[PDB]
Amino acid sequence: NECLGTIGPVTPLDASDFALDIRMPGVTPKESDTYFCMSMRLPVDEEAFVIDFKPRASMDTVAHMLLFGCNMPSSTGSYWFCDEGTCTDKANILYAWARNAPPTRLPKGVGFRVGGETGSKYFVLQVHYGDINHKDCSGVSVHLTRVPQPLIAGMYLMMSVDTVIPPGEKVVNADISCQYKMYPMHVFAYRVHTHHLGKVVSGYRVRNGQWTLIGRQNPQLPQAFYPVEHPVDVTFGDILAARCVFTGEGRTEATHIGGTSSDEMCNLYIMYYMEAKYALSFMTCTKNVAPDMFRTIPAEANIPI
Ligand SMILES: [Cu+2]
Ligand SMILES: [Cu+2]
């Protein structure tokens, strides 16, 4: 969509509500497969709750977009190259968008809590461009009310650290496993990033070895925030298990976990809501404390698609 210039990025929708348009300050990218980043501070210096997302990019030429919150972006830029980087702190993701894969709405009564003493001070907008003279604005409008929300959003990231894929190695599994600590969470959507060797990602709840699937996606598919059929009450003492499967047939050297095209990532992003009272904005698992368990896993997790 177009550029604003005289209208600016902030739109009141009334007093206790406005939308915020986060869009690249007129960019002219002359590369195919190019990742561009930029940051914007909150208008209000407080607890807002981010309640919607209106996506706006030339389907022509915009492959995928990610929006996270964090309190210190990786450059003082007008824009920059995301390979340079997002937030030098934890960038916790709010929104993801894919072309061939329209996202879903948040549920009414839900919102990511931002700013204030605790919440995120900045939004950072990663914007992937596909194949390709002029000037580009495209990106994401928000809609954030000051009105507190019943159900707070957040992310449980399960991600491998140590994984390694030996070259030509028909199959290498990577497994994450964590025990649940906080108040329960209903899980309403998901996404799954891995680079190429990604055959398939998948993730579950386990209550007395009782596997009840969350998400399953071949990560070469556009890694949107895909919805979870019927919601999943993750309570205390449940185990989050996840498996990315990769192959090594592809390249001539040892692939390890990393943020570059040549490396791999087994990330599984798990977007939940919790009761306001009990809610906390993001959890994480870098461990695989229940490793043996996984024999019990579904074979739906180990065969492809
Ligand atoms: Cu429930
Ligand atoms: Cu990556």
Author numbering: 45 to 176, 182 to 354
Authors' text:
Two enzymes, peptidylglycine α-hydroxylating monooxygenase (PHM; EC 1.14.17.3) and peptidyl-α-hydroxyglycine α-amidating lyase (PAL; EC 4.3.2.5) working sequentially are the only proteins known to catalyze this reaction. PHM, a two Cu enzyme, catalyzes the stereospecific hydroxylation of the glycine Cα of peptidylglycine substrates. The two copper atoms in PHM, CuH, and CuM (located in the N- and C-subdomains, respectively), each use a single reducing equivalent from ascorbate to catalyze the reduction of molecular oxygen for the hydroxylation of the Cα of glycine at the carboxy-terminus of the peptide substrate. Crystallographic data on apo wild-type PHM and on several crystal forms of three CuH mutants (H107A, H108A, and H172A) presented here show that the copper ions are required not only for the catalytic steps but also for substrate binding and for locking the overall conformation of PHM in a configuration that is catalytically active.
The structure of the H107A mutant crystallized in the same conditions as the wild-type is highly similar to that of wild-type PHM. The structure, except for the lack of Cu2+ in the CuH site, is very similar to that of wild-type PHM (RMSD = 0.42 Å for 283 Cα carbons). Despite lacking its Cu2+, the rest of the CuH site shows little change except for the absence of the side chain of residue 107. The mutant does have Cu2+ in the CuM site and the geometry of the coordination is almost identical to that of wild-type PHM. The main difference is a small (<0.5 Å) narrowing of the space between the two domains. The coordination of the copper at the CuM site remains unchanged and even the two remaining histidines at CuH site show only minor changes.
